[PDB]
Design a protein around this ligand. Structure first.
Ligand SMILES: [Cl-]
Ligand SMILES: [Cl-]
Ligand SMILES: [Cl-]
Ligand SMILES: [Cl-]
Lengths: 212, 211
């Protein structure tokens, strides 16, 4: 029930402000606004409580305030590590008790573009004996988040049997994705090799694996 | 360190019941109000319920009223969420958190436990070794439902260089993931590397040597 902008962005060393609008039932009437930082794959971390107070350990770059029905989180001296989703919440009376905002994605501009590290594994002997073959292409530490992967049997494009994840942000603010190719053991042994080829901003990284 | 160890999540049919536990230590659990907050995959935080320090007063979101019941055992430092009548829309990661004060901010959060409300039945994964200055070796954890699966290496002894990847969701409705670890090339064929795979919903516990 609290309204926050979907997205804010700034460059390093800049200041940004995230707004959190409620009503007199919650934000307007109480000093019970708290703000949370959440990195992808992690629990939320309290940055601010009782509108303006900072838990021990929180950078004094973070500050909070409130005017009428709107509370504000300020980050000054922006650092790449501040990239994260931020959430406000408020006490909301004896009945509703507590409300969250819908979250704000903060992006910090000027992050180095980074090429994917690619690791390609062949099928294990154990899997081959079990009458299957999975080629595993692991793609990491790339930014920005968009890649397209294409598989090749020898030099020929393979479409069938491919499952590829959507990239999703890692700890470091860089992305990871996986792509899986399913083959019969017979296909695996009747090519010279297979390749996983990752395109990331005009530029291709390719890895190749061969039977034993 | 302050710890909020969650359990009791996993797979449940629509209409079914679970009980989440959150075991606290390294603070005086009986002094503080506690909350459960949930987060559906790719979505925002939603407050579920809170309970005052004595456990005598409790508060619950309208979305959950009459279905979930928060409670605590101060003696055993544990916070519970009894969840009855579960629906698909309750699928979410559930966090417990210690609140600085009742109705105020939450200053320590547990790591979350995934609750999957689905009619699909559990399936345990197959596990396969991934082998080839620096080198990468891994384990392939294939065809399981629901999430999550946990992977450690050498029983938690190896942590540096470990990257467990987000799982793919196949057309079939089954998940697969890989965990990889980068090591010095010189380590191969001297050090022993073993992935420990756990898929709690199927009680699958697997150790694979990787050569
Ligand atoms: Cl005011
Ligand atoms: Cl206003
Ligand atoms: Cl669990
Ligand atoms: Cl083994």
């Amino acid at each position: 029930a609290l309204t926050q902008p979907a997205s804010v962005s700034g460059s390093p060393g800049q200041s940004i402000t995230i707004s959190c609008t409620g009503t007199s039932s919650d934000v307007g009437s109480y000093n019970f606004v708290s703000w949370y930082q959440q990195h992808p794959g992690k629990a939320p971390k309290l940055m601010i409580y009782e509108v303006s107070e900072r838990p021990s350990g929180i950078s004094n770059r973070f500050s909070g305030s409130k005017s009428g029905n709107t509370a504000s989180l300020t980050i000054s001296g922006l650092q790449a590590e501040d990239e994260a989703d931020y959430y406000c919440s408020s006490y909301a009376g004896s009945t509703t008790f507590r409300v969250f905002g819908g979250g704000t994605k903060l992006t910090v501009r000027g992050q180095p573009k980074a090429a994917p590290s690619v690791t390609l594994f062949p099928p294990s002997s154990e899997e081959l004996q079990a009458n299957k073959a999975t080629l595993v292409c692991l793609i990491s530490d790339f930014y920005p988040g968009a890649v397209t992967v294409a598989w090749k049997a020898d030099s020929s494009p393979v479409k069938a049997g491919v499952e590829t994840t959507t990239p999703s942000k890692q700890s470091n603010n860089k992305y990871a994705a996986s792509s899986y190719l399913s083959l019969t053991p017979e296909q695996w042994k009747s090519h010279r090799s297979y390749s996983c080829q990752v395109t990331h901003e005009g530029s291709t990284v390719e890895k190749t694996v061969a039977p034993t | 360190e302050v710890q909020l160890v969650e359990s009791g999540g996993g797979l449940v049919q629509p209409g079914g019941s679970l009980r989440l536990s959150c075991a606290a230590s390294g603070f005086t659990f009986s002094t503080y109000a506690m909350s459960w907050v949930r987060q559906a995959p790719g979505k925002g935080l939603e407050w579920v319920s809170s309970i005052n320090n004595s456990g005598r007063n409790t508060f619950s979101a309208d979305s959950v009223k009459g279905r979930f019941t928060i409670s605590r055992d101060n003696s055993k430092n544990t916070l519970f969420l009894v969840m009855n009548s579960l629906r698909a829309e309750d699928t979410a990661v559930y966090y417990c958190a210690k609140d600085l004060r009742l109705g105020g901010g939450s200053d320590y959060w547990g790591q979350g436990t995934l609750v999957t409300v689905s009619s699909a039945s559990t399936k345990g994964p197959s596990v396969f070794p991934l082998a080839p200055g620096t080198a990468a070796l891994g384990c392939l954890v294939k065809d399981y439902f629901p999430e999550p699966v946990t992977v450690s290496w050498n029983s938690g002894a190896l942590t540096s260089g470990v990257h467990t990847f987000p799982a793919v969701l196949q057309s079939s409705g089954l998940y697969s993931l890989s965990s990889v670890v980068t090591v010095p090339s010189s380590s191969l064929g001297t050090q022993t590397y073993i992935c420990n795979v756990n898929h709690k919903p199927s009680n699958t516990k697997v150790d694979k040597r990787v050569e």
